[PDB]
Ligand binder design. Structure first.
Ligand code: J6K
Ligand code: CL
Length: 289
């Protein structure tokens, strides 16, 4: 089976948890803690390693933004440090193209990054690429058809409905059609030919709305809203279904996990995380050991 891994997050302070959910049987496993607690990080998978990227350690003893890339091997249930990024990136978004990891945006203190860098596992090296046209933290990132999309976020002044696309062979960013909704800290992922943006914060409210961008039509369309309003949710795709994990609804750090069936256009509660949290990193890979 493949599992949905949730790494880090926030409740009262930044968390070190790594836990893995099995959609086939409803079970959660607690696995090895992150070496450093972090919220506002991103997860991704390349070649059966799980990567935790960026974030911030919000702790009683200080707040430290992370430039870390940490490598988890499910076969050994151990974390190893991999090469650090050029800069700390809190409230980061990540995407994988052709075995390479793109780290997009995020903050370092009051610095809101437009910069983007790319990691090569074979060399354990990061290299900067062209920066986005817009500074974005709490940025949603997805990959469709080997193109990288940066969606919404916060530019240091305004939360954003704008989005843009990176063309690797041109090393160039271009704006796409903006969303219908301003969203910072949305969950962004890809399913079929569409980029989904679920939830987020608009500077006033946490959102339950969900909309999707069809690369062929260049339009955003709303689908059914989630059962819960959520900002700083985790999101992933497992077998043609979107799963959203946790986040903040204006009142509670949610343990709710919901999944979306695109054929019925419905959201269903699927499970609860072992404890409520937001700002997690999420990805899917093989079950450990
Ligand atoms: C300033 O108020 C908020 C800003 C954000 C945005 C940033 C912005 O638009 O300014 C944002 C986006 C992405 C992440 C991962 C986070 C951090 N996370 C919530 S977190 O879970 O990592 C976290 C939790 C509490 C304290 C620190 C960390 C924030 C979302 C909010 N939703 N409600 N409000 C009241 C929000
Ligand atoms: Cl933060």
């Amino acid at each position: 089976g493949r599992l949905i891994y949730t790494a880090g997050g926030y409740f009262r302070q930044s968390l070190s948890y790594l836990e893995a959910y099995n959609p086939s049987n409803g079970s959660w496993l607690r696995l090895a803690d992150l070496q450093v607690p972090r919220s506002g990080l991103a997860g991704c998978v390349v070649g059966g390693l799980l990567y935790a990227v960026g974030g911030r350690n919000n702790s009683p003893d200080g707040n430290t933004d992370s430039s870390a890339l940490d490598c988890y091997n499910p076969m050994t249930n151990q974390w190893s440090p991999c090469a650090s990024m050029s800069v700390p990136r809190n409230r980061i978004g990540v995407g994988v193209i052709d075995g390479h990891i793109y780290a997009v945006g995020g903050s370092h203190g009051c610095i809101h990054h437009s910069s983007v860098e790319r990691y090569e596992p074979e060399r354990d090296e990061w290299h900067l690429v062209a920066p986005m046209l817009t500074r974005r933290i709490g940025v949603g990132v997805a990959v469709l058809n080997r193109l990288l999309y940066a969606v919404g976020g916060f530019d240091g002044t305004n939360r954003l409905n704008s989005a843009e696309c990176y063309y690797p062979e041109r090393n160039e960013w271009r704006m796409i059609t903006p969303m219908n909704t301003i969203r910072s800290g949305a969950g962004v992922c890809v399913l079929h030919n569409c980029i989904y943006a679920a939830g987020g914060y608009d500077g006033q409210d946490q959102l339950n709305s969900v909309e999707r961008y069809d690369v062929e039509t260049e339009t955003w369309t709303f689908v059914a809203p989630m059962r819960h309003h959520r900002s700083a949710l985790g999101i992933t795709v497992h077998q043609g279904k979107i799963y959203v994990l946790g986040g903040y609804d204006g009142h509670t750090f949610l343990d709710s996990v919901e999944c979306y069936d695109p054929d019925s256009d419905t959201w269903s509660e699927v499970t609860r995380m072992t404890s409520g949290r937001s700002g997690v990193g999420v990805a899917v890979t093989m079950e450990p050991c």
